[PDB]
Design an enzyme around this catalytic site. Structure first.
Site, mmCIF file in Angstrom:
data_model
loop_
_atom_site.group_PDB
_atom_site.id
_atom_site.type_symbol
_atom_site.label_atom_id
_atom_site.label_comp_id
_atom_site.label_asym_id
_atom_site.label_seq_id
_atom_site.Cartn_x
_atom_site.Cartn_y
_atom_site.Cartn_z
ATOM 1 N N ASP A 174 1.104 -1.041 0.015
ATOM 2 C CA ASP A 174 0.061 -0.020 -0.034
ATOM 3 C C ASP A 174 1.080 1.341 0.019
ATOM 4 O O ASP A 174 1.930 1.204 0.478
ATOM 5 C CB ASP A 174 -0.928 0.113 1.207
ATOM 6 N N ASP A 226 -0.104 4.972 0.886
ATOM 7 C CA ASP A 226 -0.347 5.765 1.907
ATOM 8 C C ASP A 226 -0.158 5.247 3.255
ATOM 9 O O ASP A 226 -0.607 4.078 3.561
ATOM 10 C CB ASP A 226 -1.744 6.564 1.750
ATOM 11 N N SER A 270 -3.246 0.894 -4.533
ATOM 12 C CA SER A 270 -3.750 1.992 -4.015
ATOM 13 C C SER A 270 -5.070 1.988 -4.295
ATOM 14 O O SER A 270 -5.639 1.743 -5.304
ATOM 15 C CB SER A 270 -3.002 3.070 -4.585
ATOM 16 N N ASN A 271 -6.011 2.462 -3.517
ATOM 17 C CA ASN A 271 -7.374 2.713 -3.532
ATOM 18 C C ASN A 271 -7.693 4.153 -4.052
ATOM 19 O O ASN A 271 -8.906 4.339 -4.092
ATOM 20 C CB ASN A 271 -8.066 2.434 -2.172
ATOM 21 N N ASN A 272 -6.597 4.883 -4.101
ATOM 22 C CA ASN A 272 -6.866 6.003 -4.791
ATOM 23 C C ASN A 272 -7.577 6.106 -6.148
ATOM 24 O O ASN A 272 -7.368 5.019 -6.821
ATOM 25 C CB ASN A 272 -5.432 6.713 -5.064
ATOM 26 N N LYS A 305 -8.999 -2.381 -2.465
ATOM 27 C CA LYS A 305 -9.053 -3.123 -1.298
ATOM 28 C C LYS A 305 -10.076 -2.912 -0.217
ATOM 29 O O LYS A 305 -10.297 -1.339 -0.215
ATOM 30 C CB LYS A 305 -7.458 -2.834 -0.726
ATOM 31 N N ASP A 342 -0.693 -0.223 6.172
ATOM 32 C CA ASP A 342 -0.857 0.432 7.516
ATOM 33 C C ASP A 342 -2.339 -0.049 8.215
ATOM 34 O O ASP A 342 -2.514 0.125 9.410
ATOM 35 C CB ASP A 342 -0.456 2.006 7.121
HETATM 36 MG MG LIG Z 1 -3.094 3.447 2.673
#
Ligand SMILES: [Mg+2]
Ligand SMILES: [Mg+2]
Lengths: 304, 304
Positions: free
Chosen positions: A26, A28, A59-61, A223, A248
């Site tokens: 991940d 962030d 990334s879920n961005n 995710k 995280d």
């Molecule tokens: Mg993150």
């Protein structure tokens, strides 16, 4: 198998990292917090690369695209990084629609999201509409429901959209009156973490609203939805048994690992704390306890 | 006792209706469908009044104030109606806040809802802000979070709001960062029924959105929330054992009746069908099975 939430060090650390064919990160809270990065993170990748280990980033961005993400890596001191290693919810969302809208000509999607998400769709051949502000015009319902829509729309894609409005909610619901139409949610996160510990409403709030109105279960990309892995395994050969998932956040990253059968490693930099992890172990929630944990991903190096 | 979904005619119709001290009516789908009223509905009310039975009316509507609702009744051919008999989710929302802000000076509420909802609050002494369009300006989060808010706000009230936006969602979450702040939802309905069988997104979609972002369980007023009854019992002495709940929907009106201990009567002139009722009885889900049912509320007259 059963996450004992052990701190990953020395003997065990060399074993598990050593055996790993690859590592899944991940972004962030793991590699960086804002533009200020986690000490030794860049070096870790260098050593993972030279160790002959494939590193991928998830990334879920859903707001900013692959190109601008690769650049972000460069800006923060991460070099020798190929764009092919980057997987965002927007990218994988586009990948889903391309597969689903296979033999459909001039595939169109209504997009409650960012220009990036649109770009990822436009890269796979799917044209987009709905990006940007859609303020509510009209006195009442009869006016809102008379707004002309796109006939070729074959999907509703809900990403992060700060321009989300009741008007967009209405259009999405109208589009979804055709049962054949698809509903995709980039991620189900209730909150979007911000740089200095702040947050704002997460995409999952917008998704859940459309789901309720349209009375549908949306297909979720990011995710902890296993499709994120699906998106990856289509491009890369990833034996989950020999791959580490590092994140995280427990409710996204760790749950993701367990669902995909990856050995999960919680880093204590970022969102989650160890007390919470043990609390889950402590509470009987068998699926959110990380197999191992480290103070920072920098600790992973001696395993190499 | 245990609702068997029995057709209410003759002896049974004479017994409970005869014994009933009062009757509680949902409005939409019972008294009327859109601007078309159910034949003999006015007559039923006239005859209930002369029978010496208290009739009350409950609605999850949050767009119409008590006054404007009374007019709807009169104009649609229902006469001799006191406003005191009318209970909307907006009204009871005001009643709740007044009780909860029992001793707060200059109480203010942020309202994601209608001017009417504001009026019910303003009639009860609660000042309101947030009604109307709230367009999102600024490039990113730092701009959205720097917008100055109203300092005296002690409640977020989510009603039906066609101006609902990510900015309003954001303001709501910020207000709710103070735990002492209240979160109230007028109703949790997935959809808002429209005149000719159409529909649009329901208030419950917006509420769930605020709940997820703020990570709060909002206090719900409207059916099937028992508070609707509490709101009523503050005004009227209602022995639920001697009160009939009449509604068109099983999941709102009937569920409401069971939770309050009222004898429930499903009218088949509305949303729910007899088939669905038998499905629940067949499934053992006791809280959605009507004790009795009638093709129309007009059938109730022969009980008098
Ligand atoms: Mg993150
Ligand atoms: Mg109704």
């Amino acid at each position: 198998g059963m996450a004992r939430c052990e701190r990953l060090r020395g003997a065990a650390l060399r074993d598990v990292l050593g055996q790993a064919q690859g590592v899944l990160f991940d972004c962030d809270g793991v590699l960086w917090n804002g533009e200020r990065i986690v000490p030794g993170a860049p070096e870790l990748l260098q050593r993972l690369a030279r160790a002959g280990k494939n590193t991928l980033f998830v990334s879920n961005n859903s707001r900013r695209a692959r190109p601008e993400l690769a650049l972000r890596f460069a800006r923060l001191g991460f070099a020798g990084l190929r764009a092919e290693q980057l997987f965002s919810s927007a990218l994988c969302a586009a990948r889903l629609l391309r597969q689903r809208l296979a033999g459909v000509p001039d595939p169109k999607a209504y997009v409650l999201g960012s220009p990036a998400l649109a770009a990822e769709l436009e890269a796979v051949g799917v044209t987009s509409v709905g990006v940007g502000p859609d303020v509510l015009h009209g006195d009442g319902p009869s006016d809102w429901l008379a707004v002309p829509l796109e006939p070729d729309v074959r999907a509703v894609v809900v990403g992060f959209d700060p321009h989300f409005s009741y008007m967009k909610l209405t259009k999405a619901v109208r589009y979804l009156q055709q049962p054949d139409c698809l509903l995709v949610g980039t991620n189900m996160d209730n909150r979007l973490p911000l740089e200095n510990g702040r947050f704002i409403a997460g995409t999952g709030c917008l998704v859940r609203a459309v789901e309720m109105a349209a009375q549908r279960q949306a297909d979720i990309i990011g995710k902890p939805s296993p499709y994120m892995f699906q998106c990856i395994t289509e491009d890369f050969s990833v034996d989950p048994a020999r791959t580490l998932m590092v994140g995280d956040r427990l409710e996204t990253d760790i749950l993701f690992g367990h669902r995909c059968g990856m050995t999960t490693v919680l880093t204590l930099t970022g969102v989650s704390s160890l007390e919470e992890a043990q609390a889950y172990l402590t509470a009987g929630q068998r699926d959110l306890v990380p197999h191992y944990y480290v103070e920072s991903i920098a600790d992973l190096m001696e395993g190499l």
